[PDB]
Amino acid sequence: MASETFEFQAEITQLMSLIINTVYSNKEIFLRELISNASDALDKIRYKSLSDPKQLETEPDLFIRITPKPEQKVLEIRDSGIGMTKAELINNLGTIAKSGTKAFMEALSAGADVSMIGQFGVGFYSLFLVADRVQVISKSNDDEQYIWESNAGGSFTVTLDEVNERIGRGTILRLFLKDDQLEYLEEKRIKEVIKRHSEFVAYPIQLVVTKEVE
């Protein structure tokens, strides 16, 4: 598959740098940000399905699912929400600087809690606290499955998905964790963070665990 390359909006890049380099502690917050988005996307499919029940048939179950993958140092966060089409992947995750991107960078500088990122509607980028490379794998009812990829550089890429498993509907966040952030592949740590900061979530939050049989 041919891949297409795009430059990040100049302030989105700034922000990613202020994230990767400016904030230190409380990096566990990336999880609630990515669970929050998962819920906000599941909300939209559940709303749309009220007047278009057929929207749900491509994936009748509404859930949030986290999968630790120790071997490839990867943490994945899936939902069966509304999904994103190629154009939205492009617009919502790079080319267009969502209103508030610069505002949070300013807030942050004046002395703001990095945990307030979500209230500026930029929570997505908080993932770079624990990861240096990310794959966003989406499937909308109205397009094929695609892969959006950023390595924290200045650009990103979108490629028709012919390599990943078929998600019926929704999105997968394949975070490639930093060597010093691998505690998030642990069942207990994840399970902790989730209970402390994600109590009021309307959807099933499944944790996928792999254990050798003795």
Ligand X SMILES: O=C1CCC/C=C/CCOC(=O)c2c(O)cc(O)c(Cl)c2C1
Residues binding ligand X (CB under 6 A): 34, 37-38, 40-41, 44, 79, 81-84, 92, 124, 171, 173
Dig out the tokens for 86 from the structure: 């190629």
Q: Return the number of the residue (82 or 185) whose C-beta is nearest ligand X.
A: 82
Question: Is residue 2 a contact partner of residue 84, using CB atoms and an 8 Å limit?
Answer: no
Q: Which is nearer to ligand X, 2 or 50 (CB)?
A: 50
3-state secondary structure of 150: strand
Assign 71 to helix, strand or coil. helix
Cβ atoms of 22 and 32 within 8 Å: the answer is: no
User: Element (H or E) spanning 196, and its range?
Assistant: helix 187-197
Q: Calculate the alpha carbon distances from 91 to 8, 24, 68, 107 in Å.
A: 10, 29, 29, 24
> Annotated binding residue at 195?
no
Residues 119, 125, 128, 130, CA torsion sign: positive
Q: How far apart are CB 70 and ligand X at their closest, in Å?
A: 22
C-beta of 109 vs 208, nearer to ligand X: 208
Q: How far is the CB of 113 from ligand X (least distance, A)?
A: 20
- Least distance (Å) from ligand X to the CB of residue 41? 3
Q: Decide whether 11 or 40 has the Cβ nearer to ligand X.
A: 40
In whole angstroms, how close is the CB of 214 to ligand X at the nearest point? 37
151 among the known binding-site residues? no
Establish whether 100 is an annotated binding residue: yes
Known binding residue 54? Answer is no
Q: If we measure between CA atoms, which residue out of 172, 139, 174 comes closest to residue 58? A: 139
CA 43 to chain centre: 16
- For the bound state, the minimum distance from the C-beta of residue 173 to ligand X, rounded and expressed in Å, comes to 6
- Alpha carbon distance 34, 196 (integer Å): 15
On whether 214 is known to bind a ligand per the annotation, the reply is no
* Distances from the Cα of 80 to the Cα of 57, 83, 179, 188, angstroms: 11, 7, 29, 24
- What is the C-alpha radius of gyration for the chain, rounded to an integer number of angstroms? 17
Closer of 68 and 123 to ligand X (Cβ)? 123
Q: Is 136 among the annotated ligand-binding positions?
A: no
111 carries a ligand binding annotation: no
Q: Which residues are annotated as a binding site?
A: 33, 37, 79, 84, 92, 98-100, 119-124, 171
Q: Which residues are annotated as a binding site for ATP?
A: 33, 37, 79, 84, 92, 98-100, 119-124, 171
